Design a protein around this nucleic acid. Structure first.
Ligand SMILES: [Mg+2]
Ligand SMILES: [Mg+2]
Ligand SMILES: [Mg+2]
Ligand SMILES: [Mg+2]
Ligand SMILES: [Mg+2]
Ligand SMILES: [Mg+2]
Ligand SMILES: [Mg+2]
Ligand SMILES: [Mg+2]
Ligand SMILES: [Mg+2]
Ligand SMILES: [Mg+2]
Ligand SMILES: [Mg+2]
Ligand SMILES: [Mg+2]
Ligand SMILES: [Mg+2]
Ligand SMILES: [Mg+2]
Ligand SMILES: [Mg+2]
Ligand SMILES: [Mg+2]
Ligand SMILES: [Mg+2]
Ligand SMILES: [Mg+2]
Ligand SMILES: [Mg+2]
Ligand SMILES: [Mg+2]
Ligand SMILES: [Mg+2]
Ligand SMILES: [Mg+2]
Ligand SMILES: [Mg+2]
Ligand SMILES: [Mg+2]
Ligand SMILES: [Mg+2]
Ligand SMILES: [Mg+2]
Ligand SMILES: [Mg+2]
Ligand SMILES: [Mg+2]
Ligand SMILES: [Mg+2]
Ligand SMILES: [Mg+2]
Ligand SMILES: [Mg+2]
Ligand SMILES: [Mg+2]
Ligand SMILES: [Mg+2]
Ligand SMILES: [Mg+2]
Ligand SMILES: [Mg+2]
Ligand SMILES: [Mg+2]
Ligand SMILES: [Mg+2]
Ligand SMILES: [Mg+2]
Ligand SMILES: [Mg+2]
Ligand SMILES: [Mg+2]
Ligand SMILES: [Mg+2]
Ligand SMILES: [Mg+2]
Ligand SMILES: [Mg+2]
Ligand SMILES: [Mg+2]
Ligand SMILES: [Mg+2]
Ligand SMILES: [Mg+2]
Ligand SMILES: [Mg+2]
Ligand SMILES: [Mg+2]
Ligand SMILES: [Mg+2]
Ligand SMILES: [Mg+2]
Ligand SMILES: [Mg+2]
Ligand SMILES: [Mg+2]
Ligand SMILES: [Mg+2]
Lengths: 95, 239, 158, 14
RNA sequence: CCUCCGCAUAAGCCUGCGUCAGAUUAAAACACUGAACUGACAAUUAACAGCCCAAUAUCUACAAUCAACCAACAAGUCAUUAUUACCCUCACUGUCAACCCAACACAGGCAUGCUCAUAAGGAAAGGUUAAAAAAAGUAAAAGGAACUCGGCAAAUCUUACCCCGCCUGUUUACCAAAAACAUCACCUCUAGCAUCACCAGUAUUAGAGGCACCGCCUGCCCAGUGACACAUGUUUAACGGCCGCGGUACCCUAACCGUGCAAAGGUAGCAUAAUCACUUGUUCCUUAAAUAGGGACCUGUAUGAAUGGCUCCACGAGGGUUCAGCUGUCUCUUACUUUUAACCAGUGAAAUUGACCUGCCCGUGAAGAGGCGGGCAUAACACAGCAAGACGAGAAGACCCUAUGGAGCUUUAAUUUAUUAAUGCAAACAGUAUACCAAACCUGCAUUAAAAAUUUCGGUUGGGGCGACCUCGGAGCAGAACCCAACCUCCGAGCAGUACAUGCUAAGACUUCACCAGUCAAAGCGAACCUCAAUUGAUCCA
RNA sequence: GCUAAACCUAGCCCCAAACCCACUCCACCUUACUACCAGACAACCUUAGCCAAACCAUUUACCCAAAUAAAGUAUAGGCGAUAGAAAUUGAAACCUGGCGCAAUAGAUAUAGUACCGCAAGGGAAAGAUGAAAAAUUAUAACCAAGCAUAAUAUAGCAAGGACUAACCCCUAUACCUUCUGCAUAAUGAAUUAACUAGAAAUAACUUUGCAAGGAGAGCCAAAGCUAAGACCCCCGAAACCAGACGAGCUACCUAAGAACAGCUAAAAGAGCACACCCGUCUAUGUAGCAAAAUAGUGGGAAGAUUUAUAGGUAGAGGCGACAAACCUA
């Protein structure tokens, strides 16, 4: 994944991860379901409703994506009207 | 590669000239033609193919005297040494030319055709229609490039307002200017087809290498082809 | 000298391509040089000459980075030297025509000693400078006699 | 095929 | 005693057996002192051979072969003149050797002249003995190929037949010399022409190919592909191909018929062949005995005519059979000589080697034990033999498989035309009475073609290949939570039918052993008051 | 006690600073190292491929402005392996060193020499007294394998338990790797000396500092931030591409040469047969005389013959009477 670049000696990031996933500052990664816009004419409304969901990733997948991205994508952002602003923090979680 | 052609001498002469072989190689040293190389050594007799060429300070038609008829290793037909005025030259011997004969080289074209024995050169317009001819040119004064091989001959077919039509040994017809010189009769050394090589050694003496032993499968070209004769060749410029 | 894709799509083969200009042989006249030149030309420089209104104007206006020709730079140096010298260009008996051609190009004619080094490569410049400073050595006899006579004059005048 | 390995001469100074 | 040597020149090499000293040492395959050397000193003397020439024009048809008769073809190795310029002379270099190319003082390689056994030049035995095995010879009773795959080898001189290739010739330097390749002869295709090949040539020529002297012949076919004609054709001595069923008299086909198809349905000839198998086909000769050889038969169901067919002369280190001969090939081996050998003297390798104080039998065990179990055996130590074992040494098996490891070759594998050649359009030019013609070379684009280029050639598999399979569901195996393999046993699926709230949201759960996918569902907002088992396909991109 | 052993210093490495060199006479682009003669030709051009994408087919960092930061961000891309800016920021003139090597190390270097190759090209090894050698004296020994002093003793992985005694008694299937499993008769290893193989990030953990702030600008921060520690081997293909060097071997050719006794001569790509060319069969040899030889036996030997000299054609090629032949074993 180019741990060391030939120009700066820096770690690089896989841009497919950035194009496909969103990282909340707590450490959670959000993805879209596969096939959520393919052949909707053979799918039931419940299946399509569960396909339209934004879902969380595994612990293993989260660590893999953290390895595949650089620390720039893990900083705390303060956008103006972020629809995911309230999801960047964890509440009432115990160990 | 350092290749210099042996054809390097700017003055006509009668004495035979040493000719270097090639082996089917061009100036770069690579084989350009296959099956060529290593025969008997030969010398070159210089053949004057411009049959009508008057001497210095002389203008009109002239007569010549066949001194000898000799074998040429460089060509199929034999060559006649012929003297005239104060100069001698080699020309292509036609059939029934022997020592002691006289040959006419004429330029003036006549109102009525002339009677020509088998060794003279007249403009194709002055000749009768249907005569057997050889050593023909394309432009007037160009020099004989067409029929020159042993026993081969062509025929004058027609005469047109300023041109003449000639049939080649391959039966292709060509029109040339009326003032184009040609010699009457068939070329000598007939019965050249009936020569039997007898053995591969004689081919080697002739200077041709054996064919490759690789087996080539035949393509679509190999079958017999029946084509019509190609169109007329024309050497007459027209604005 | 570049490369292309087979059908202008990047997922096909890459082939090395060469694009060559269409060259033409044409004849030109120089009013400053009063000579007719045959040059291998192209449509672009024909258009440039048309825009500049004459071969002389085109050559004198275009810079070296645009003429792209040692022949053009030599022509430029020839015209510049002609203008700087104001020499008998056309011929005798036509002084007013010579002057008129000269005044057609007043916005030119850099000084004479500067117009020589126009359009000269480094090798030509070094060779010109080397032949400039040839100056075969002077015998020491002259130097010593001059020094001795100056010493004698100095000693005598005191 | 005809697999042959040429011999190797050691340096003459030894 | 040997001499198949030698002496010169060329080429190569470069002081490399001339003298003196050191020889205490050092290379001498040992030594004396000199070919496997150290230092110093000394020599190869030009007439031999190298090293040449003043221009400008011009001349140079008649081979050589005792060159004389004769006779040819493959047609050849040697010559001047005219005018101007020109009166100095013997420099320079090679000259040695026992010698060069082969890592060597190497049984190899090496041009020419001269005598072809010498007038040159050389020494097979360090000494001894007289074993085996081995090498090279000589002689051999009686027999005479009984040997053997085979008359290999040896000894004697040798008859006849067959297959293949006409012949002489060429080829895998280093395992194949042939039947293979070429080859005179025959035939097909292409080309109307000048300066760098072809060619200083011109259709009786040149080039690209097939086949293979000669003799008799080479049958039918253009449906398909290719090539040439653009008139829907021509072309097989181009790539190639030359039928099927049923009825057919006691045996067999069968002339004949009905039919279908095709371009034609294999003609002549030859024939169990160098010709799939059956096959040691059948039959006669040959032998005592014949899967061998020769001569005849054609279901040769896969013979066959320039993929050339069939005879034949001569030829062949080709492959077979044979008469006679004579031979230690053999019954059946023996004797001697030389080399080797063994001992003495001198000099002195290499592969190999975990360490070894290194036995036999039976059993065991990663399945074939010197080393383990049970027995037996057993003082130590040289020398000569032998080859049963040490799964003996050598070469990281070449056979087989595997590798998203290579490469050569062929295509009708995928991708492309950068390149060459054609076309068409554009650019460049010029007259021309509202129309037309557009020379050539460049350049850009497009198409066609030749030549190519790059890359790859899935997996499972009671080895691989071939066959079969690859996704999803139901049943058994797998009997009572779940799960559970098989190139195991059996069924199926790749849809269909009906509403169009088959709307929207949202607790809590299941889950094909991961993930991705997949499944169920309360409450709520709206609105009336879902069947089925599988029925399926991610991302990118469009 | 022989062979041996041991030794410091030639030099070298990495930095810094500074821009660095070259005619005594003679010769040297022809066959370089050549004193002295009439066609004057001439260079300027997009690398490719290995490799990665776990195949491969578009694609795959490597280019010559001090740093740092923006930032591995915008962007590019079989949107995938990977590739990747800029605006902007700001970058204190002088000081002659070494937690480098010390003869298998450090330069290949005592030297690009010897040696190998036709050529391009490849490429070594090694030395050690002392103030004085115009001190050759007696000391200085001690130490690897290999041997000698000094061969051997029934029986057995070589030892261990022992024992008064070396052996005899009893127990015991070398090591490494590879495997389901090896004493295995599976690999590797004669032996000694020297050399010879784990390189780093994200995020965590521990230990400090400061603390809603930390940090010596940039960055992070709902206890964080800063600093440190700790951490990812060695040898090996068959290949591919670019540029040079090769036809003194061999294949074919060009120029100009040479050789072929004797007999039968039919006239002759005729016959026997020398020299000469080739290599049929046998035996020997097989680390050989020889990286293809020897002896005998053979094919040809006036021709499509053999052969000396010089020259030509070269690798995406040449040449080939096609053997996938040959182009320096
Ligand atoms: Mg032919
Ligand atoms: Mg052929
Ligand atoms: Mg001498
Ligand atoms: Mg040798
Ligand atoms: Mg003598
Ligand atoms: Mg002797
Ligand atoms: Mg003896
Ligand atoms: Mg002896
Ligand atoms: Mg006997
Ligand atoms: Mg028998
Ligand atoms: Mg028997
Ligand atoms: Mg024999
Ligand atoms: Mg033959
Ligand atoms: Mg040959
Ligand atoms: Mg061979
Ligand atoms: Mg040969
Ligand atoms: Mg052989
Ligand atoms: Mg043949
Ligand atoms: Mg036929
Ligand atoms: Mg058969
Ligand atoms: Mg028999
Ligand atoms: Mg023969
Ligand atoms: Mg001895
Ligand atoms: Mg056993
Ligand atoms: Mg023994
Ligand atoms: Mg053992
Ligand atoms: Mg073995
Ligand atoms: Mg192996
Ligand atoms: Mg694989
Ligand atoms: Mg497989
Ligand atoms: Mg199987
Ligand atoms: Mg699950
Ligand atoms: Mg509800
Ligand atoms: Mg790859
Ligand atoms: Mg890999
Ligand atoms: Mg592969
Ligand atoms: Mg910047
Ligand atoms: Mg060193
Ligand atoms: Mg070194
Ligand atoms: Mg010791
Ligand atoms: Mg015991
Ligand atoms: Mg196993
Ligand atoms: Mg065991
Ligand atoms: Mg083992
Ligand atoms: Mg193994
Ligand atoms: Mg071993
Ligand atoms: Mg590869
Ligand atoms: Mg290749
Ligand atoms: Mg040569
Ligand atoms: Mg003969
Ligand atoms: Mg003979
Ligand atoms: Mg073949
Ligand atoms: Mg083959």
């Amino acid at each position: 994944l180019t741990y060391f670049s030939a120009r700066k000696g820096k770690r690089k990031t896989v841009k497919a991860v950035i194009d496909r996933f969103l990282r909340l500052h707590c450490g959670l990664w959000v993805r879209r379901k596969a096939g959520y816009k393919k052949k909707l004419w053979k799918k039931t409304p419940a299946r399509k409703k569960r396909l339209r969901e934004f879902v969380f990733c595994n612990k293993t997948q989260s660590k893999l994506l953290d390895k595949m991205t650089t620390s720039f994508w893990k900083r705390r952002n303060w956008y103006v009207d972020d629809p995911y602003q309230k999801y960047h923090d964890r509440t009432n979680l115990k160990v | 590669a350092n290749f210099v052609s042996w054809k390097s001498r700017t003055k006509y002469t009668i004495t035979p000239v040493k000719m270097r072989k090639s082996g089917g190689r061009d100036h770069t040293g690579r084989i350009r033609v296959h099956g060529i190389g290593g025969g008997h050594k030969q010398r070159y007799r210089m053949i004057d193919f411009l049959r009508f060429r008057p001497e210095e300070t002389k203008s009109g038609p002239f007569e010549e005297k066949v001194i000898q008829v000799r074998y040429d290793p460089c060509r199929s037909a034999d060559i006649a040494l012929v003297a005239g005025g104060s100069r001698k030259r080699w020309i292509i011997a036609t059939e029934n030319m022997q020592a002691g004969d006289t040959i006419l080289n004429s330029n003036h074209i006549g109102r009525m055709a002339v009677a020509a024995r088998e060794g003279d050169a007249h403009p194709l317009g002055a000749l009768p229609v249907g005569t057997l001819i050889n050593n023909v040119e394309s432009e007037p004064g160009r020099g004989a490039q067409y029929i020159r091989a042993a026993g081969t001959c062509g025929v004058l077919l027609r005469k047109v307002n300023g041109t003449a039509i000639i049939q080649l040994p391959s039966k292709r017809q060509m029109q040339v200017l009326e003032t184009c010189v040609a010699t009457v009769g068939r070329v000598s050394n007939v019965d050249h087809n009936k020569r039997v090589i007898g053995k591969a050694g004689r081919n080697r003496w002739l200077g041709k290498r054996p064919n490759s032993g690789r087996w080539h499968r035949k393509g679509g070209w190999a079958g017999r082809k029946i084509r019509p004769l190609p169109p007329m060749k024309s050497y007459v410029k027209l604005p | 000298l570049g490369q292309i894709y087979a059908n202008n799509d990047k997922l096909s083969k890459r082939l090395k391509k060469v694009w060559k200009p269409q060259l033409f042989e044409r004849e030109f006249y120089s009013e400053i040089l009063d000579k007719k030149f045959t040059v291998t030309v192209t449509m672009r420089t024909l258009d440039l000459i048309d825009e500049a209104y004459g071969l002389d104007f085109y050559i004198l206006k275009t810079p070296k980075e645009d003429l792209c020709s040692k022949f053009g730079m030599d022509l430029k140096r020839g015209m510049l030297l002609r203008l700087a010298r104001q020499d008998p260009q056309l011929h005798p008996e036509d002084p007013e025509r010579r002057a008129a051609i000269y005044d057609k190009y007043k916005e030119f004619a850099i000084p004479e000693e500067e117009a020589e080094w126009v359009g000269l490569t480094l090798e030509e410049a070094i060779e010109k400078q080397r032949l400039l400073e040839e100056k075969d050595p002077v015998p020491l006899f002259k130097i010593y006699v001059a020094e001795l006579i100056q010493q004698l004059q100095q000693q005598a005048l005191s | 095929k005809k697999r042959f390995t040429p011999p190797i001469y050691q340096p003459k100074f030894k």
